[PDB]
Symmetry: C6
């Protein structure tokens, strides 16, 4: 990534083997569960476009997924050119294209240039925004079942049902009461309006 | 987080993959056991609001819990605005809202600004206070059984009973004697008043 | 590798035991699966030719593979000499041969010289390009089956078929529709032209 | 803790996730075996009172134990006040109470102040002394059996008996000969006085 | 080892517990497989003779091996004296003997002196050359079977045979065709001369 | 330990949790196998007497052993006083006793003083010498069987016998031929005198 030294200067640093290992393992073990996204964002703190491609290209499985991502990334590159066309001067910075932000037509040297520029063109963050929009589309896609089929088991503790409800709800981005079992529906109906989730859960314990 | 370099200056540092891994694993293995809280507080030393959201958003399970937390965080944002309303000047700091402290309406850039300000507005610590108040409410909620149902087994060693008693007592935040078995109740009654826990446990060995 | 200190200077650093361990483990567990290549490239960031030989020479198995690599590396050394022949001056830099870039006839001292030169002769990157061209030839070679034999199981979920299709396709570097089962072929044929992979997969869910 | 930078200054540093993990694991696996204490002391090198509370508060089990510790810590706070009563001046240091050394009534800011003072008030070491005196009381308490019941098995190798003897002896803080079996008692009696443990063990091999 | 600080100076650094652990584990798990040597060389980057003895002396098994190594090291010490005899001056450097390079008759202080000298006497690299020549002799010795007994199974895939061939060949430091099975011998004979290993393997797939 | 910063100065550093973990694990898994000693020496590089006590006091088992060590350490303290008696001056260094080198009667402050003195009194190395002499006595003691009972199995490969021979020989600190089986004795007798171990082992393969 790009990080601050101890003497203030912004400088390139090899992506750590820890960071490389963590991303591949998280993908192995959680596929496209929604919590995976903030894990990506954190593990890619200060990342060059080169670093971002490395993290995506190290995934062995989920290639239907990594192909939809390319589709999404390209749609975002086109839109970028549409908004910032381009026409260089010896030892002068060249403006970036869509394909330059997504690191396919740019060098690490240019990427370090733009991101450390004063003022900086933050190509790492622009690309990451594109990637995250794409990973979100995939998460919604790979949610195994709909919020409509999340109903509480007649013998299912309220808390464990809420957990299923808001798990599903997060993947897809008073239905809680509707889908509740009759025993707990009864108590919730009685609580009146403007009940907090804490109160709802207390009540049904 | 924000940490001191070696040359004195306060500067931003990527949250470590070790720290990211430790929090998710602790939540996996201890759920909302009370000891989890000081583990959160320590693992989030020097954390920006961005860092705090990352640690919460990396949890995959316990979404009933992470939803009550939002409820608690929002109640605290409202109370913040109630106490510090707001109305910016070119390249000048803008005062923070409730949603700015909780990192939903603020940039990492602004967060670094406030926290490194001279004097600093410590938005990281203010947010963490909010989160911890919320995690406490959850711990009390998820205590499996009441201190009233903690009674010593007729064949249960005193020490292992005390451990159950003060485990329960910590989750909920001479009852010890009341709930003791008759053999050990007898000895404790005899010890008279102002007996230390050490003496109580010695006596019953 | 060669890395920047904290005071700006470009300086040699022992290859870390973490990096040494990661490469050998990745080769143990993924053989010449295509995702292995970007893992090599990342783990060898800033690498001297000496460092590159170390990473290759630490592999115990796959010696048919590591022999084809030598064949490829030598073909690239010849081509290098063909393009940059050579004829030294006391305490002056000597131009590098093919065998010098591939680190067989050069010292670590000379390698540090060329790579830190102003302007630098980047022998590490030139060699890595050679190695990667060679590892690619091997990946294609060790793809277990052809894209032609990737057809969807009559009871195989579309998503899991796409994953097999683009796994195979990556190793080898509307056939998707051709190879689809009849139920899903039907729906895809109906979608008309210019359908995105996301739409294709949605449709077949 | 408080540690020296590279430029000499004494400065605060987040407690490492390694250190956090090591203490909790050691307690999991060795309970209050006597060797645990020097492990605590080492893992808490340079620790603020805040750091010390964090290490204690991260333990989930052994709450009878962690309650006796509070009892011991409070007895030591009282004794501290008894010896150093207190009565502040704008931007001037306030003398610490018992509860300030044990980090319950003090800020991290004040703790950093006292410990980096010239001359320093070493509140970290004063607290640690209190804690260690308390953990010792617990170790003695949780020694499973008395030195009197450590006798050598008629078919038990001398060395393995000595190990049991000095294990027990350390937990509790020519009895060796008394408790020896008759075969080895015989040889030891014969060795005369002023025999080294090495000679004793040699003799009985 | 000896490493560069951040301020340029060459300075001594404790051998890391990671490096200590890695060498012992590699020896545990691969014995004197040829790939072990480049692993030694890399793990001992910048090593003092003291560091080299530490790495050898931490091996518990393979003592027939570690004794042949001493034999080889001593033969190299004699040859060193034969080539550089010796006859010191207050606070002046004394020339090194064979036993000084191999770290048996020298202090760490002297080793740091020679290796940081301007110009440096690189006793670490001279010793490592000796050790590696010795470890090579051992690898050849502990090759389980001869290249002559590497023949392709009638039902053995060509690739897996090449792997056995070049594994054996590396330990010992158109025989491929000779030893091939008749089906694959046939195709290889037909390929004519100057066939690349890639072509040979393609052909036999 | 005491280590060099990046700015040259010799300064105290907390013993790492890695180093703490490595020593305890090595003792768990190898007891007093001779290879354990160089592991101790390396893991305790730059160690204060305080650091040395920490490493010994973290061992839970082997207390017969750790008691003989105290016996040995005390014998060495007496001998030290015998050789360097003592009689302090305000803010002036006090000469060390036997008990000061072994860190029982000295502060970490004094230990840092002596070891960083110009010229330094190296109390860490003096103590470590004492400890190592003691651990050696223990290794010899805990060698399970004598070199006299190491004889080659009639069906035991020569190499595996040499390994047993020199394992035993190292613990205790042409007998090889004597103890050889008759088949291999025969060949060795025939080799004549001045045969290298390599030749001996070659011959018997």
């Amino acid at each position: 990534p790009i990080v601050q030294n101890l003497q203030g200067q912004m400088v390139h640093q090899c992506i750590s083997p820890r960071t490389l290992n963590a991303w591949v393992k998280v993908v192995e073990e959680k596929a496209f569960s929604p919590e995976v996204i903030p894990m990506f964002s954190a593990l890619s703190c200060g990342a060059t476009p080169q670093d971002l491609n490395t993290m995506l290209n190290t995934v062995g499985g989920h290639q239907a997924a990594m192909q939809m991502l390319k589709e999404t990334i390209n749609e975002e590159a086109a839109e970028w050119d549409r908004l910032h066309p381009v026409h260089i001067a010896p030892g002068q910075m060249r403006e970036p294209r869509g394909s330059d932000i997504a690191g396919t037509t740019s060098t690490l040297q240019e990427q370090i240039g733009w991101m450390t520029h004063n003022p900086p063109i933050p190509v790492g963050e622009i690309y990451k925004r594109w990637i995250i929009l794409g990973l979100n589309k995939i998460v919604r896609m790979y949610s195994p079942t709909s919020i409509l089929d999340i109903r509480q088991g007649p013998k299912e503790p309220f808390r464990d049902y809420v957990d299923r409800f808001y798990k599903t709800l997060r993947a897809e981005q008073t239905l809680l009461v509707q889908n509740a079992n009759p025993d707990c529906k009864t108590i919730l109906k009685a609580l009146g309006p403007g009940a907090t989730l804490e109160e709802m859960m207390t009540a049904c314990q």
